[PDB]
Design a protein around this ligand. Structure first.
Ligand code: COA
Ligand code: COA
Ligand code: COA
Ligand code: TYD
Ligand code: TYD
Ligand code: TYD
Ligand code: CL
Lengths: 187, 193, 188
C-alpha cells in the first residue's frame, strides 16, 4: 500500500541483459525474456505494464501503468529522457490486416504476413496516454505525440503530433535541451 | 530458474485448466494466470486458444478455435453472451459488452443500483469467422460483426457490420473491402493436418 | 466468482474512511489509502489504480482498468457518479510543450507540472476508455462518451463526445426523479 516496486535485491535476480541504478520496477508488471531487456539508470516502470522480448530503455524514463512494449526479436529502443504515458502500446511486429494472410500466435508463420521493424523513441520523446506505435518507425528527437494518437510512420524531429493516424500540429519547444544540460551539470 | 520465476510465460498448465471449471475447454489452450475469469461454468473455449495477461472474461463467453485474445482485453458476456467463431482474433485492450446502461439521463446506472431503476440494453455480440478487432477498440451490445470483417485500432462499433469489409473510426465507417485470400489459406492450412 | 476483499481485509487496508457494502478487487492497486475516503455502496474492479488523494461518495462503480491519480490536490466523486472501464483521471500532469522536463524521474525544479482538483458532480457518467485532465469540474449530470478527452470543465446536464470533447446534446433529468424515488423507497 506504499509502493509495488522490486528491491534492488530482487531486481538483480530477474536476469536482465543489463539494469542500472535507481530502477523502480513494479511487481505487478510482466517481464518476458528478461535476458534481452536492457534498462539504464533512473527508470520507473509501473503496475500492469508488459515488457516482452527485445526492449532497450536508457536513463531518466518513466513507463507509466498499463503500457505494453512488444519488442519481439527486432526490438524497441528508447533513448535518454524518453517517457511513455499510461496505457500505450508499442509493437515491433504486427499481423497483416488486409485479408491477404492468416493472423496471430495460434497460426504458423508460413500462412501469415507479419510486418516487423525496430522501433526507436529518440531523446526527449513523450508519448501521450492511450497511444499506439506501429512497427518500423522512429519517433523523432523531441517529438510529443498527444493522447489517443496512432503512429504508423516515422515522425520528424521536434514536432507535436495528434490524432488517428497522427498529423503535425505545432513545433515542440526546445527549452528542454537547455534544461537537460542544466540538470546534468547540477549532477 | 526463468520459467519458475515467471519470466517465460504466465499460462496455466493443462492440469490447472481443468480445475477452473469451464463449461468446455479444448486442447492447446494457453490462458494467463494474470487474466480474470468469472463464472467459468458458462464459459467455453475450443482448441488452439491463447488469452493473455490482464484480460477479463466474465459471464457467458464462447470462443471457438485458432483465436488469440490479447492482453488487457475484457469480454463482458453477462447472461446474453459473446460468441467468437473460428479464426477470430481480438488485439490488445479491446472491450466487448453484451450489456450496457442507458446514458441518456432517463435511467440510473451500474451495479450499485437495483434494476427497476435502470434501463440496461442487452444483446448477443457475435464475431463471425476470420474477424479481427484492432487494438484499443470497443464493441457494444447486440452487434453482429460479419465474417472476415477487420475493425481498425481505436474504433467504436455500435451496429452490425457487413461481411468482408474494413471499418475504422469512432463510430466506425466502412473504408474498403477486406481481401479474401484468407479463405484459401484456411483451406490450405487445414488440408495439411 | 469474485475477487473482492472481505470486510476483514478492508479494515486492514487503512483507508482514511470506508463505508458499508464496499466491494474492492484484490487485483486493484491502492496507494496511500491513508488519504482515500470511500462512502457506501461502492464497487472498484480488477486492475484499477487509486493513488493519492481520492474521495468517492456512495452508489458509484469504478469499472476495471480505471486509474485515478489524485496526487496531493485530489480527485473527488459525488454520489451516483460512475466511471466505466479503462478511464484515466489525472489531478496532475506534465507540461507537454517542450518548456520543461517531464515525469517522476526528474526533480520538480526542472518540470512544469499542472495540478488542480478534479471533481465529478452527482450523476456524472464517464464513458469507457476516456481521459480527464487536471483542474476540471465535470458538471452535475454530464455524460462523456467513450474515448473522450476532457481538458476543461464541462457544463451541467449535457452529453459530450470526442477528442477533445464537444457538447452534442442535453442530458435528461429524469435520473434525479429516480434518485429520489430510490432513496425514498430505502427509508420507509
Ligand atoms: C497534444 C496536446 C499537448 C496539445 O495541446 P495544446 O498544445 O494545448 O493544443 P490544443 O489543445 O490547442 O489543440 C490544438 C489542436 O489539436 C487538437 N488536439 C489536441 N490534442 C489532441 C489529441 N490528443 N488528439 C487529437 N486531436 C487533438 C485540438 O482539437 C486542436 O485542433 P484544431 O487546431 O483543429 O482546433 C494535448 O492535447 C494532449 O494531448 N496532451 C496529452 C497529455 C497526456 O497524455 N498526459 C499524461 C502524462 S503526464
Ligand atoms: C485499419 C487499418 C488496417 C487501415 O490501414 P490501411 O488499409 O493501410 O489504410 P490507410 O492507412 O491508408 O487508411 C485509409 C483511411 O482510413 C483512415 N484510418 C486508417 N486507420 C484508421 C483508424 N484506426 N482509425 C480511424 N481512421 C483510420 C486513414 O486516415 C485513411 O483516411 P482517408 O481516406 O480519410 O485518408 C490500419 O490503419 C489499422 O488500424 N490497423 C490496426 C492494427 C492493430 O490494431 N494491430 C494489433 C496487432 S497484430
Ligand atoms: C455518447 C453516446 C451516449 C452517444 O450515443 P447517442 O446519443 O445514441 O448519439 P449518436 O450515436 O446519434 O451520436 C451523436 C453524434 O455523436 C457522435 N458520437 C457518438 N458517440 C461518440 C463518441 N463516443 N465519440 C465521438 N463521437 C461520438 C456520432 O458520430 C454523432 O455525430 P453526428 O451527429 O456528427 O452524426 C454513445 O455514443 C457513447 O459513447 N456511449 C458510451 C457507452 C459506454 O462507454 N459504456 C460502458 C459502460 S455501461
Ligand atoms: C502508479 C503506481 C504508483 N506506485 C506508488 C509509487 C509512487 O511513488 C507512488 C505515487 O505514484 P503516482 O500516484 O504516480 O504519483 P507521482 O506521479 O507523484 O509519482 O505510488 C506504485 O508503486 N506503482 C504504480 O503503478
Ligand atoms: C503478452 C504475453 C506474453 N507471454 C509470454 C509467452 C509468449 O509466448 C511470450 C511472447 O509473447 P509475445 O511477446 O506476445 O510474442 P509473440 O507475438 O511472438 O507470441 O511471452 C505471456 O506469458 N503472457 C502474455 O500476456
Ligand atoms: C469485472 C469484475 C467482476 N467480478 C465478479 C463479481 C461480479 O458480480 C461478477 C460479474 O460482474 P460483471 O461481469 O461486471 O457483471 P455485472 O455488471 O452484472 O455485475 O464477476 C469481480 O470480482 N471483479 C471484477 O473486476
Ligand atoms: Cl488497460
Amino acid at each position: 500500500h506504499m509502493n509495488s516496486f522490486y528491491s534492488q535485491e530482487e531486481l538483480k535476480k530477474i536476469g536482465f541483459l543489463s539494469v542500472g541504478k535507481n530502477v523502480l520496477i513494479s511487481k505487478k508488471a510482466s517481464i518476458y525474456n528478461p535476458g534481452v531487456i536492457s534498462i539504464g539508470n533512473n527508470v520507473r516502470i509501473d503496475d500492469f505494464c508488459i515488457l516482452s522480448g527485445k526492449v532497450t530503455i536508457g536513463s531518466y524514463s518513466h513507463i507509466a501503468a498499463y503500457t505494453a512494449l512488444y519488442g519481439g526479436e527486432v526490438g524497441i529502443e528508447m533513448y535518454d529522457f524518453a517517457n511513455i504515458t499510461s496505457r500505450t502500446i508499442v509493437y515491433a511486429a504486427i499481423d497483416d490486416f488486409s485479408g491477404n494472410a492468416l493472423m496471430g500466435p495460434t497460426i504458423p508463420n508460413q500462412y501469415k504476413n507479419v510486418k516487423t521493424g525496430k522501433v526507436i523513441l529518440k531523446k526527449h520523446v513523450i508519448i501521450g496516454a492511450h497511444s499506439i506505435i506501429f512497427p518500423n518507425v522512429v519517433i523523432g528527437e523531441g517529438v510529443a505525440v498527444g493522447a489517443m494518437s496512432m503512429v504508423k510512420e516515422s515522425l520528424d524531429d521536434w514536432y507535436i503530433y495528434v490524432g488517428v493516424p497522427v498529423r503535425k500540429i505545432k513545433a515542440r519547444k526546445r527549452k528542454i535541451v537547455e534544461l537537460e544540460n542544466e540538470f546534468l551539470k547540477s549532477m
